[PDB]
Design a protein around this ligand. Structure first.
Ligand SMILES: [K+]
Ligand SMILES: [K+]
Ligand SMILES: [K+]
Ligand SMILES: [K+]
Ligand SMILES: [K+]
Ligand SMILES: [Mg+2]
Ligand SMILES: [Mg+2]
Ligand SMILES: [Mg+2]
Ligand SMILES: [Mg+2]
Ligand SMILES: [Mg+2]
Ligand SMILES: [Mg+2]
Ligand SMILES: [Mg+2]
Ligand SMILES: [Mg+2]
Ligand SMILES: [Mg+2]
Ligand SMILES: [Mg+2]
Ligand SMILES: [Mg+2]
Ligand SMILES: [Mg+2]
Ligand SMILES: [Mg+2]
Ligand SMILES: [Mg+2]
Ligand SMILES: [Mg+2]
Ligand SMILES: [Mg+2]
Ligand SMILES: [Zn+2]
Lengths: 38, 122, 38, 222, 39, 51, 43
RNA sequence: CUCGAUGUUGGAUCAGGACAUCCCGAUGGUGCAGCCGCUAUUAAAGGUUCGUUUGUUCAACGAUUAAAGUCCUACGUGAUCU
RNA sequence: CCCAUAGUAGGCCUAAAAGCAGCCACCAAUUAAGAAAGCGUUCAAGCUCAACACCCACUACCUAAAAAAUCCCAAACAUAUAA
């Protein structure tokens, strides 16, 4: 196996991959785009 | 190294918003849990395997009743990721000797003491 | 034309144009400045 | 009538006697004899030293972990000393000279037979550390040109920053964490060991909170 | 080829430490702890 | 009016519940009379037995 | 063409696995159950 | 993986394939006047020599050629040979 | 986009240093133009930039590619209401 610190970006365990996917930043979306209002 | 996980006590302190979402009463805590295993113990550490057996959760999707007390909760927390915990509700009170044989545990968690298998005239 | 990953204008007369699906740098004053997106 | 604006005055700024960057030696004064382990956790995770400005106002921020050898210091020194104005600028080192010995076995030898001999030295660097700090009678646009050129040649992800941009960078990250609409975060899940997720995680993930993977730093992770 | 210059260093663990923790019942003579230095 | 101004499916207007309750009673009465008068031949049934 | 070196799902170079939409929904569904478990264990 | 055998160099024979093109085609730049070149883009249809010493692949040398390309194919190919 | 006169080739150094090899100063004419930010000239000339005027250019200021050897490799699809 590879060490915890590698020169390349090590492949993640699939469960961790899923964890990252589910915890991504979701920006606040306004009801009306602010450019469409006075 | 992989070890047992210490869960911070803050995780088990409900906020006012939680009480609205789930509908529990902090001043009238439910007496009994309904506990059902919904996850396998395969590919889990042995200590989790051992607690599932102790709680009588070897067979999945089989509701078990347990006392809502610190000691029991301590076991439940180790395997909280393997089970579903719901409060036992008694809309008509506890079963008595007369109605022991006419009870049914519904999917809502309510243990009813009469099971007629008839439509409601209402 | 020299292939370039990063296109840079080398004089005032250089002008960027996108043709045949890739960016080009064209220069009439100094044809040596001509670059193709790689 | 194009509206003119006031300009900042740097008369109150002082320039040291040796504004240029001093020379860094290949190996320390006294050569080391005791061979050391890799200790790869010295470039892993956030940095806890040299994360703030001390004297100058501009610096090169490290966005990842890595090791710096003499070849890197010479590139930084020459590139900066050539592109800077000694009269109105000054630079200092924010990283110590190579001290960590790196052993290496001879070519063609098989596995085993003890440990290799000390070959060269490196300076471990963590993410979020300042590598070089500059200052003086100059704006950001002046140093940013050749500072970014240097940052691109470093073995890790780096970027030139200022007292303002660095502060804004940090405040923007906090704003993202507060307004994040996702109810599920890496911290909440990991610390509570939800789904038994700590079986595929590391003990360091409790503190890194998913923002670090080996030596790589991910600023877009909240 | 080459050889390592570090010899020795193969002593086994002494199995020292506390034998009777707080609250344990001991009879006279029972060893409570073993130690190399006064801990 | 554009290709995406409104949904692709047609708009459905369900019957008035009061009017439909009366129509339902008529249908049930008609079918009940067929039973009383024996206006059916062979019947089939779906029965649950042994699981 | 398009070989993965050695065995597919082990070692240094691996076949990339991607997270599908339903894989995400599956995880969130179980996160909600555990979140509720936390609540009922608090009283 | 194979030791209840997957025959080990170079050559002969016949070659399949890649293009990171040696020659032939088409192009941009040049410190491209022209003739010669250098450099990059595109192109794998077709072609890519004979000798002296050496077991040699290589290397050196002689005479040529539009050019004497680089590699992979169990360092292609011994139930075809040497 | 548009446009550029002038004390003056500022002093010193220098064979020569004229905004632009170096050192010091970096003041001032014209409503407006740095004792000059980038080229250039052996030194000069010469071409731009920061000026004025004109006038709503009413900019984004976060990023960068590709090749191997028998033959690409499921077929396909942007539109009917989670399950
Ligand atoms: K870099
Ligand atoms: K592999
Ligand atoms: K064998
Ligand atoms: K011979
Ligand atoms: K001069
Ligand atoms: Mg390991
Ligand atoms: Mg020891
Ligand atoms: Mg031992
Ligand atoms: Mg394989
Ligand atoms: Mg055999
Ligand atoms: Mg052939
Ligand atoms: Mg080609
Ligand atoms: Mg062979
Ligand atoms: Mg034979
Ligand atoms: Mg054969
Ligand atoms: Mg003048
Ligand atoms: Mg003079
Ligand atoms: Mg002068
Ligand atoms: Mg000059
Ligand atoms: Mg003036
Ligand atoms: Mg102008
Ligand atoms: Zn040009």
């Amino acid at each position: 196996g590879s060490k915890a610190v590698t020169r390349h970006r090590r492949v993640m365990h699939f469960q961790r991959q899923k964890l990252m996917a589910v915890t991504e930043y979701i920006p606040p979306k306004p009801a009306i785009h602010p450019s469409c209002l006075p | 190294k992989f070890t047992r996980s210490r869960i911070p006590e803050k995780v088990f302190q409900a906020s006012p918003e939680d009480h609205e979402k789930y509908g529990g009463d902090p001043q009238n805590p439910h007496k009994l849990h309904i506990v059902t295993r919904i996850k396998s113990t395969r590919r889990r550490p042995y200590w989790e395997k051992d607690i599932i057996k102790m709680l009588g959760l070897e067979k999945a999707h089989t509701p078990q009743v347990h006392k809502n007390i610190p000691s029991v909760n301590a076991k439940l927390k180790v395997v909280k990721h393997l089970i579903r915990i719901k409060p036992l509700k008694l809309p008509q009170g506890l079963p008595a000797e007369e109605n022991m044989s006419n009870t049914c545990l519904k999917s809502t968690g309510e243990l009813v003491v009469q099971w007629h298998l008839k439509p409601v005239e209402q | 034309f020299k292939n370039k990953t990063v296109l840079k204008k080398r004089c005032k007369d250089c002008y960027l144009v996108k043709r045949r699906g890739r960016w080009y740098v064209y220069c009439k004053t100094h044809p040596r400045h001509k670059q193709r997106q790689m | 009538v194009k509206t003119l604006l006031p300009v900042p005055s740097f008369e109150d700024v002082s320039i040291p006697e040796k504004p240029k960057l001093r020379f860094i030696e290949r190996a320390p004064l006294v050569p080391k004899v005791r061979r050391e382990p890799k200790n790869l956790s010295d470039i892993r995770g956030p940095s806890t030293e040299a994360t703030e400005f001390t004297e100058g106002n501009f610096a090169i921020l490290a966005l990842g972990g890595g090791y710096l050898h003499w070849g890197h210091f010479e590139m930084m020194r020459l590139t900066i000393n050539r592109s800077m104005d000694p009269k109105n600028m000054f630079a200092i080192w924010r990283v110590p000279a190579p001290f960590k010995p790196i052993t290496r076995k001879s070519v063609g030898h098989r596995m085993g037979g003890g440990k290799g001999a000390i070959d060269h030295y490196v300076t471990p660097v963590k993410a979020g550390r300042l590598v070089v700090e500059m200052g003086g009678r100059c704006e950001f646009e002046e140093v940013q040109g050749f500072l970014d050129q240097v940052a691109h040649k470093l073995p890790f992800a780096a970027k030139a920053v200022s007292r303002g941009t660095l502060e804004k960078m940090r405040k923007d990250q906090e704003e993202r964490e507060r307004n994040n609409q996702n109810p599920w975060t890496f911290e909440r899940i990991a610390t509570a060991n939800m789904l038994g997720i700590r079986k595929v995680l590391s003990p360091y993930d409790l503190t890194h909170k998913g923002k670090y993977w080996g030596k790589f730093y991910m600023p877009k992770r909240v | 080829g080459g050889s390592s210059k570090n010899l020795g260093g193969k002593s086994s663990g002494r199995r020292q430490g506390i034998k009777k923790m707080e609250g344990h019942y001991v009879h006279a003579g029972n060893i409570i702890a073993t130690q190399r230095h006064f801990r | 009016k554009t290709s995406l101004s409104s949904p692709p499916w047609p708009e459905v207007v369900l019957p008035d519940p009061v009017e439909e309750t009366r129509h339902h009673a008529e249908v049930v009465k008609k079918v009940n009379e067929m039973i009383v008068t024996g206006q059916y031949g062979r019947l089939f049934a779906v029965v649950h037995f042994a699981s | 063409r398009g070989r993965i070196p050695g065995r597919q799902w082990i070692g240094k170079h691996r076949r990339p696995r991607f997270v599908s939409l339903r894989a995400k929904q599956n995880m969130i569904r179980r996160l909600e159950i555990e979140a509720e478990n936390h609540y009922w264990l608090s009283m």
